Each structure stands twice: as C-alpha cells, then as structure tokens.
Design a protein around this ligand. Structure first.
Ligand SMILES: OC[C@H]1O[C@@H](O)[C@H](O)[C@@H](O)[C@@H]1O
Ligand SMILES: OC[C@H]1O[C@@H](O)[C@H](O)[C@@H](O)[C@@H]1O
Lengths: 695, 677
C-alpha cells in the first residue's frame, strides 16, 4: 500500500548532477547527493553501474564531486572530488576505486566564510585545490587551473575598489588564477596567471579548445565596453596569443549543430522554430518543434566526433517534461518517454546513452537508452526509500488569467482525498521550476509540499507566466537584463510582476469554482523569484491569508546601490531621484499599508533589503516574523538553498506551524520554536482595523 | 640654536599620556607615554617612574597598552591594567618599578574591530581582554574586578529584533557575558554575578563602584552585594560632586558663568562669578578628597581655551594660574600635591608638580626631548565672529619664515571644539600634518565650531539633535548646527584675506568625523574653498538612516522616502553633489555605505573626488576611527599634502605615496564640468 511522507523523506531526496559513461558504454558511474543527518550536510555517494547487467555497486561517499568525465585513451574516469581536505582532481579506475591525480598542497578558502574568497557567488564554504580541468582528445595532455591565495600586505584601496566593498558581511581574501598544462612526460608548466576580476577564470567548467599545436581557452578582462577574449598557448614554441572577437566563437560555443552553426529556438506561441545559424549568418531551419532548448535543467548538449549527430536536452511547451532530441542533416526527431530525462551521459560515438528517469509523482530511476532504436530499458532505482512511499496524487494543469497569459504548474491533492472536498490551499511558486521532476529543491525549497498534502492541504505549484508565450512579456525581460527601456518601467512592473498576481488569483478562483479550495484559507510561499511574487501579491492582493518569503530583498530600495542596472528597468532610476513616486506605488516596503496577511521571512543573508521589509511591515501593524538561519559556525554563513540539515528541517517545520496557525488556527507544541505561538497571538490581537474582514 | 623644522615622524611620534598617578606620600609618581613605534607599526606605552622632588625619571619597560593606573590604598605599590601582547590582565607595579601580576585570566576574549571578536565601542584596536575593570577597597584589602567571558553556545537562529540589529555588520562577532568577582584579603576570589552583553556599564562602563559597610555597591543597566551573607540585593532609590555633597554645575551663558553646587534636594549654592567652563573628558577630570572638604576639577577657559585646575572648598573657589594647559594630573588622596602634564599649542609636553596649598608650579622637565629640538612655529590665538553674531575660536598657524605683507595659501582644519592649548593633539588635526603645511608655506587655520554655550539658539538645537526630535524645526537644526559654521568659516577666510594674510584663490578645508560633516556641508553650500578632505565621515547621508534613525529624525524630520524627502534634497551632501566645484578627498577606515554614496554621487556629478580606504594590520581586522597603524596615518598625511599641493598649488612630487594618482588627478581635473571654471 505504501507509507506517507515523513519530513525526512523530503530532506533525503537525492540529486544526481554528475553522470558519466564509458567510451564503450559497458560501464558507467554517477554520484547521488544525499542529505546526511549525522554529518549535518549533504554527502555524495559514488556508485558504479554495469549498463549491460544492470547491477550497481557503491564505492565511497565524498563531500563534493564535480566535473565527472571519462579519461580518453583509457577506461578510467576523472573527477574533482573533496574528501574533506579540499577539492582535488582524482582518477577512478575501471574497477571502481579512486586514486589521486593532481593535488594542490595549498587549497584556498571559498564561499561565504571568514577570510575566504567569494568564488561562486555564495556557494558552500570549502577549500579548492583544483578549480577546473580538461583532457586532450588523445588523453596525453592535461590542462588544469588552481586557485592561489595572494600573499601580500593589506593595501590602501581606492575609488572603484571601495564601492565593491559596500555590501561586505565578512572578511575576504584576494587570489589569482594559475593555468597549468601537463605534457605526456608528466612535466607541468604554468601557462599564465589571471586576476580575480576575471569571472570566467574563477568560475570553472569552461570550454577549452585543443587544436593543432595550440590549446585555447577564454578569459575576461576589465575592459570588455564589450568583446570576446581568448588566449591560445602554443605547445611547441611555448608562447601565448590574444584573440578579440565581436561575435563569439562557435568552436568554443555550446549548442552547435551538424551544419556547424549555432542552434536556437526562435519565435513564440504554440511552438518554436529550430534553426541552425551559420557563422556567416544564413539560417537553416529544421522545422517546427514543440520544445525549448539549452536549459541547464535538461540533459545538456553533446556532438559526435564526426560532427554529423548532436543530442540536445528539450523541455516541451506545456507538459514541462524534459527529454532528448536527435539532429542530423535530415532533420530533428524527438524520442518519447513516459517520464522526464534530466541528467544524461553518452558514449563516444553518440549511440548508447544512460539517463536519470525522473517524474513529479515518481522517484528518480536509472535508465539505459538506445538512441538508434529509441528503446529505453529500466535499470535499478536510485533511492529505494522514496520508492516505498505511496505516490501522492499530482495533476498537471495550465491556467489562463484575466490578462490572457497562461501559467503552467501542478496541483497536489491531499492524502485520502475524495471528490467534491474543500481544502485549504498553499501556493508555492519559484520561476519556471514547476515541471516534471521529482521534489526538486530549486522549486519547493524549504516548503514541505509533500507533507502539507499529507496533512490535508491542497498545494498549488504554479510557475510564473512563461515569457515565451508573448512578446509583451519577453520585451519586458529584455529590458530587465539591459537595464534600460523600452518598454517603460510602469509596464515592466505589470508584465514581470503584477500579472503574476492575477494569474495566482485567477488560478485559485477557478479551483474554488471546482469546489477543491476554500478561498477563506489560502496562502502563498516562494523564495528568490518567488519572494518577489509573494511580496508583490500580498501588497497588491487581498486573497491570501498568510505568506512566507524565503531569502528575498529584491525590489526594495535598500539594495539599489548594488543592483542599479537591475532596478533601473523596473523603477526608472534611483529612489531619491525624480522617480521616487515609481518606488512608492510598487516597492513592497513602502506599500506595507496595503498588506493584510501573515508575512514570514526565512532569511540566510540578513540583507538590508530583507530587514527593511520587516521593519516596514512591523511598523504598519502587519503580523510578521523574520527568521535568520545561521551557518555551521559564526565564521560561516548559510547558502541561498540551505545546505544544513538542521536549518532545512526547522524551516520546513516553521512553515508548517506558520500556515497551520494563520490559515487553520492550529497550534502544535512540538513546533521548532515553542514560545512563538504566544507571540503570534499578540500579533493577531494587535492587527489594525484596516485588516478587518469584509462585512 | 634656533631649532630644526618639523617632520611627519615628529607629528606621528608626539606622545600622549592618559595615565598618571601619584603616591599618597607625594614622593613618587608614575605615568606612561604612548608613542608610535615604527618597528611594531602600532603605538606602545612607555612606563616611567618619576622622583617628584628632583624630576629624575627612569624607564621601567615598554608595554602595548596600559589603562587604569592608580595607587593601591594600603601601601606604596601601584596597580594598572596592562597588556604585554598576551592580552590585558591586572598587574601590580612594585615600589622599585617591577611589574608583577595580580589577576590573570587564562581565557582572554578577543575584542575590537576584527573577526570573531566582541564590539565594545568607545574606541579600541583589536586586542584580547582578560580583565576588564577593577577597583580597590578603600583600605586596600578587598579586590573587586570585572572580567569578560565568551559565551560558548553554538550558532542559533535569530528573530525579529535580533535580525534588524545585524543590519550594519561588516564582520563576524561573538557574544560574551561579564562575570564580576570579589577577592577577599585572604587571597580567595568568589564570583558575584553574570550579566548579558546588553548591559553597557558592564561592558564599556567606567570604574564607578561604592563600598558601604560590608556591601559592595556598583551600577548595572544600582545593586548591592553583601560580602558576608553572600546575598545579592537591589538597593533602594555619583560624580562631579562638590565639597557639600551635591552636584556641581555651570549655569548661565555668554563670556562669563557662575559655579553652582545643587543641594541633594535641589537648594542651589553659588561659588561666585567664574571665568571657565566645567571639566571635559580632556581636562584633569574631577577628584574629591576622602576628607570630603576638598575638591579639584579640570577647567577650560573661554577666552584662553586653556585647561587648568579649580580648587573648591568651604572657603570658596580658587583658580590656579598656569602659563600653559594642564591636561592630565595625578593627585594624592587628600588633594595636597599633584603632578601634571603641561602643554600648549607651541609648547611640548612637560611634567610639573603642583602644591595645592601655595599654588606653586615646579617644572620637573620635559617628556619627549625629540620635540624640544623642533623650533616652535608661530601660533596666534584668534576668535572670529560670524555674520550671525556667533563667534568661533581657534589658532592661526603661520608658515615658516613668515614676514610682513606676505600672503600664502590656506588650509582649514576643524573638529568640534578641539582647537585649544594642547600640543599636536591627534583628536583635532587627525591625519592632517598641520605643522608640515606651515613648513611648506601654507597658512593653517585651526578653527572650531561656534562655541555652543554662547547662545540659547545653538544649545536648543544641540539638545534637539541629541534628544532625537524637535523643537526646534529641522530647518533650524540644519542652520544652527551646520550652516552657520560654514558662514563662520567664510567670514573668517575673508577677514584674513582682507588683512593681507591668505590668498582667497588657493584655500582648502579639512576635517574628520564632526569636521567631515562641516566639510561636506561647506563644499555644497559654499564656493570659497578649492580643495577639501573629509576623514571617516558619512553622517547626514541617507544610507545611514536605517541605523542612526534617532540622530537623523531631528535634522531631516524623518525617513528619506517619507514626506520629508524634500528636506534631505536641500541639505544632505550626497544629494547636492552638483553644487560642489571643489576637490573632495575621503580618507576612510570604515568603508561604510554612507561614505561610498557621497563618493559615487560626487563622481556622477563630474566633481573631482577620491576615496582612500586604509586597512587594518590584517584582512581580519579593521582600522580605528583614529588611526592606530603607523603606515596608514603616515602616508595619509602624505596624501593630504599631495592632494592640496596638486589642487591648490598645482605642485607635483614623487614623494606621493601612490604615484598612479597624479596622472589620475589630471584626468579628473580635465573632465571637470563647465559649471566650475
Ligand atoms: O563531455 C561529454 C561527456 O559525456 C559523457 O557521457 C561521458 O561519460 C564523458 O566522458 C564525456 O566527457
Ligand atoms: O606656569 C608656571 C610656571 O612655573 C615655572 O616656575 C616653571 O618653570 C614652568 O614650567 C611653569 O609653567
């Protein structure tokens, strides 16, 4: 029959971002990131699979594993793993054991921590011995880069160097990036050194071109006005070159097709056009396609060795299901599957492939795909403990709003649900991330969607209106990234934000007409992008009784000086400029007078924008609470997506108690912070008369 | 021998003495001089013992920091809070000068501005504190000391009022508790209380504690503790106390005042018409004899701007005649003899002993012989009255080799009223080498804000700024506290320029903190100054409202986004950036959002501006509001010289600490908007 959803099952759901296949397709290897209670943070369980037999063997558990590839010229594998001493390049033999490949004796601190380097924009605090690596096609040469802490005295900084320190919450160290090359004889020389201002050099995972006597990779300099800059290292003369191009290089570009040109999906509406644009600019169309292209949530892209076949990850329109598409000179062909294929890996000749089969109602599984016959065979499950959970009832629905734009998403029915039953509702929204995938933390975050359903809630997971359905939305997006118009700021607020409030309202009213939702008790929750939507809805809508905004702060005037270009499209200028009235009408901090609801903030960054929303809401009589979740120690911080099991479990349980209280008038003694329920009773009695219910 | 000119290292190494003590027998005295060490990069205190009759001094040793230097009541020894580099502990000084420890905390907690420390305040460099405060029982047996204990609880999720307090955090911190201990004469220490960090008098608080019978009574944020019963008690419902047991006050205003001792229930008593103001924190302070019949207070004259001593008793008030200012003074218990530090604007620090009976001053010799070598600079005490009738006092510093009819450029240095008779006070001239500029040909005018005690208009505005709300009007608070000082600066410059002293074409203004506000407001509301520098500023800017709300609400009436938005736009210097045709340099240790905003606003307006951010000894520690690092304040003096010489004098040098700037300044000068020419 199955068992219900425990909160720990939401915490222990695995994530597979790394999967690789042998050049002969006989064996494969992957890693499942699982939250560990004893360690308090996620660990990656490395497993080896025999694709022919289907049997799997577990090898080890590391802290992190990244850039998992098969070593050319051998049957072995290479990866960047951290055993707890810092991330180094390791080799994994065909028998499933790992040994060091290149070890940096002095890894540098990275992430949000005291005296670390802000590398990946607030990733986990750790040490990086080896940053990035790539094999030559023959496997003889090895290219790798590693971070080197900058040993130097504290120096007087100046004009632009001070303003970059505006938002510093902790101590930082400066570094440089060293690039090395390893000949077949085992001797390594340093190619060049790049500063910290080079953002492609510090990011890693970049492209590198092995051609002729040269090895080529891309770099960024302070100037690029704008341009594309590359450096080529001659393996013979041992010299360097500098390339500057107006248009980016296709050889170093992702998503290239059999013709050799860039792939894109243009147009809007019911479907898109898949075109291949040559470097000279003449397009080649493969016809009409039902999917989008090139999403990091898809299987990525790979091209064969002859260049006549490519495989691209596809997210279809309206089914929000990830899949594969095959492209040769004849044309595009999709391949059907009952579920979505998110993370994949491919052989050398691009014939056999292995993928992670994922679904909204089904847990991740491993599958082998024969790309010639479009035949997939089921391998063993990934997480068996989620396979024993009885599947919740999940319905995929698209809603149309009063402004004509459609919003996709899913509907979670409570356990034991009977037809024609009214239930309270919780709306969880982050970006486009409601799709066919299993309990993706990038969507539901700390909101226990599956647990809310077990307790009788109807959870509505609803995406933002897809900007690709209309040029009105997409033109506002293009103005958002450009930092200028057209269109004007008043329209940017309508299409990017305010129309989502209508899509949320009109989705609840429609389901209320079905008899599935009690409009009296309903709530909205989201983080990041969803935080903006939550904060804009509760200001511009009276429909929602309670709300939870995870780690927000965009659209508030406090964070302007950091994000000017992102704010200028929305508000048309600075808060104290002549655009001040544009800030008063929209920004939620100044509009708190319009807020009647329970607004809870779960905040890891303690930013001045998150604080300004709380003080403005609290000073207006609104019932509100802010929760600052800390790092593993006072020296570190918490990431955007919480990596600490203790902060995840409580935030989940804090949302359970927050919505059970305001929506359902339900109080629990085993709640994570007991003395709060009396504080919320005081927040209820002190509510303003403005918030009185309709007569 | 006339002497030798000044040097940056002379200004840097000027000693300052905050600790001086005298034995109850008056025969021996001990003090400590804080001097900047080039080798260590930070200042170090030199403990010195003095023979009060002869003036003989010998060097005991050199320590990092020494505080709370006093004499033990029971014997001829001494006790002080000393940090040898292992953290600040409680040390006893032998009668022969040797140092032996008394209370030593094996677990000193880190404090200061730095990573994973505790942010005390006042001002502090990153350091470890084993023992915080101490006091002796009046008989010298029982010992009461305060130490700082780090709270070991793990990281906790914070909540509403806790999170908004983390708004302005630039680093990691720890939370601590204070433990109060009591040491019996038999050598056993027992713990009394434990108090949270929220208590200020227990964290940065002073030395106020009272012994009554068997009870030790100290203040918390009043409580009594019995040494016998071992029981705490919150007692039922002092400082600057005269001989009659009441509060001492100075009432009235103008150029003359009247001493008042208010009776316990408020019956006033006048000691007569008096020529000074009450003792500031920079004066000799206040001390009362255990007899209760003699009280000595530090004084500050009005016309003299000099520090001194006033001795009051049942007879009356006596004003001690001194040719220079007496800043820090050690005393005996009965207030009979005193050893003081004598200094002036042109007068290097000296040691003098004072007999309070006969009011005779006796020179015990200089302090630093290095500054005795320097030939003095001409310093004229001058008072400028503005167009509004308010007067401001200061010193006119003439350049080396100044003759009649000669005119020179000018630089105005202002902090609060810190311009008085004192020798190279770092709290006034800060990082501006006021003495070097005179050697280089400048005419430096050190001018204070208009003396607030001269009018009821100013004192009401200062009261409203401190209270946090009106009356008076926000527009009057802007005019009385700030804009009327710009008029005082303007009228003072015109007074000297008409007299044939300074050239109006080349003149500049410099200041830090309170002087930065007066620099930022002056360059916006006045065109008379070509160049400017503002140290460690950022007040009056909109970025700091969410922290300093209480301070801003009186000036602007409310938040910048409220209906008072128009009040900010007329005044706040970052919003006026297009009114500034001068060159604005910012020397900044805090890298605060209010200082960056003023820079980005001035740069967006085409104004020539630069912000120099000076770091700490490590990336894990910051630099204090007053620079304690030798390298930082050494080239900061060089930067101001290079800044004013380029803009005012159009002079270049390779001695500039940053050679890349002189070219960058050419680009900034060339891109100046058409408004300025
Ligand atoms: O880069 C493409 C990757 O495809 C994967 O399927 C292979 O296992 C890797 O060896 C290869 O690097
Ligand atoms: O002002 C009183 C003066 O008395 C003289 O006897 C001393 O030599 C001076 O040092 C002192 O300043």
């Amino acid at each position: 029959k199955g068992r219900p959803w425990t909160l720990e099952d939401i915490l222990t759901v695995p994530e597979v971002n790394e999967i690789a296949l042998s050049d002969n397709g006989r064996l494969a290897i992957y890693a499942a990131e699982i939250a560990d209670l004893d360690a308090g943070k996620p660990r990656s369980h490395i497993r080896i699979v025999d694709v022919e037999t289907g049997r799997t063997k577990e090898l080890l558990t590391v802290d992190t594993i990244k850039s998992l590839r098969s070593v050319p010229g051998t049957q072995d594998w290479s990866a960047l793993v951290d055993l707890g001493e810092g991330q180094q390049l390791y080799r994994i033999d065909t028998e499933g054991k790992l040994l060091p490949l290149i070890v940096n004796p002095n890894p540098v601190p990275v992430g949000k921590a005291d005296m670390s380097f802000p590398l990946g924009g607030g990733i986990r605090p750790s040490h990086i011995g080896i940053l990035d690596y790539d094999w030559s096609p023959d496997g003889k040469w090895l290219w790798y880069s590693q971070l080197r802490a900058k040993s130097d005295g504290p120096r007087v900084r100046f004009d632009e160097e001070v303003t970059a320190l505006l938002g510093r919450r902790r101590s930082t160290i400066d570094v440089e990036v060293d690039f090395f090359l390893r000949n077949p004889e085992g001797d390594t020389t340093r190619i060049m050194a790049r500063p910290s201002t080079d953002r492609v050099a510090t990011r890693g995972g970049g492209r590198v071109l092995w051609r002729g006597n040269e090895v080529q990779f891309r770099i960024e300099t302070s100037d690029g006005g704008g341009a594309f800059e590359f450096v080529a290292w001659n393996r013979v003369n041992r010299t360097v070159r500098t390339l500057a191009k107006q248009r980016d290089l296709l050889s170093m570009s992702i998503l290239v097709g059999p013709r050799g040109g860039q792939l894109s999906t243009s147009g809007l509406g019911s479907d898109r056009e898949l075109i291949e644009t040559s470097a000279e600019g003449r397009p080649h169309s493969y016809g009409r396609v039902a999917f989008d292209i090139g999403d990091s949530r898809s299987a990525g892209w790979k091209r064969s060795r002859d260049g006549k076949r490519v495989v691209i990850g596809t997210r279809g329109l309206g089914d929000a299901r990830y899949g594969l598409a095959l492209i040769d000179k004849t044309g595009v062909r999709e391949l059907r599957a009952d579920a979505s294929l998110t993370r994949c890996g491919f052989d050398g000749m691009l014939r056999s492939a292995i993928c992670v089969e994922e679904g909204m109602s089904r847990p991740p599984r491993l599958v082998r795909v024969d790309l010639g016959t479009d035949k997939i065979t089921d391998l063993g499950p990934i997480s068996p403990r989620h396979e024993e959970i009885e599947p919740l009832q999940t319905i995929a629905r698209t809603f149309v709003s009063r402004d004509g734009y459609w919003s996709s998403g899913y509907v979670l029915l409570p356990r034991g649900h009977r037809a024609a039953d009214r239930h309270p509702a919780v709306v969880v929204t982050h970006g486009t991330d409601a799709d066919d995938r299993f309990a993706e933390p990038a969507n539901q975050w700390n909101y226990p969607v599956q647990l809310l359903a077990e307790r009788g809630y109807v959870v509505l997971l609803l995406n933002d209106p897809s900007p690709g359905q209309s040029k009105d939305l997409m033109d506002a997006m293009h103005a958002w990234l450009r930092g200028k118009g057209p269109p004007d700021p008043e329209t940017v607020q309508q299409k990017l934000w305010l129309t989502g409030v209508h899509s949320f309202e009109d989705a609840v009213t429609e389901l209320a007409a079905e008899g599935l939702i009690d409009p009296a008790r309903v709530g909205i929750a989201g983080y990041s992008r969803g935080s903006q939507m939550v904060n804009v809805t509760v200001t511009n809508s009276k429909m929602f009784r309670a709300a939870s905004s995870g780690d927000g702060g965009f659209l508030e005037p406090a964070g302007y000086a950091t994000g000017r270009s992102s704010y200028d499209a929305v508000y048309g200028g600075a808060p104290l400029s002549d655009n001040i009235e544009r800030w008063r009408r929209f920004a939620p901090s100044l509009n708190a007078d319009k807020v009647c609801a329970a607004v809870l903030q779960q905040v890891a960054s303690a930013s001045p924008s998150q604080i300004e929303l709380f003080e403005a809401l609290r000073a207006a009589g609104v019932a509100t609470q802010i929760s600052y979740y800390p790092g593993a120690t006072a020296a570190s911080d918490e990431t955007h997506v919480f990596y600490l099991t203790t902060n995840r479990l409580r935030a989940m349980r804090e949302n359970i108690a927050w919505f059970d209280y305001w929506l359902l008038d339900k109080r629990d003694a085993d709640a994570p912070f007991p003395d709060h329920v009396v504080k919320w009773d005081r927040l209820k009695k002190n509510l303003p008369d403005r918030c009185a219910a309709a007569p």
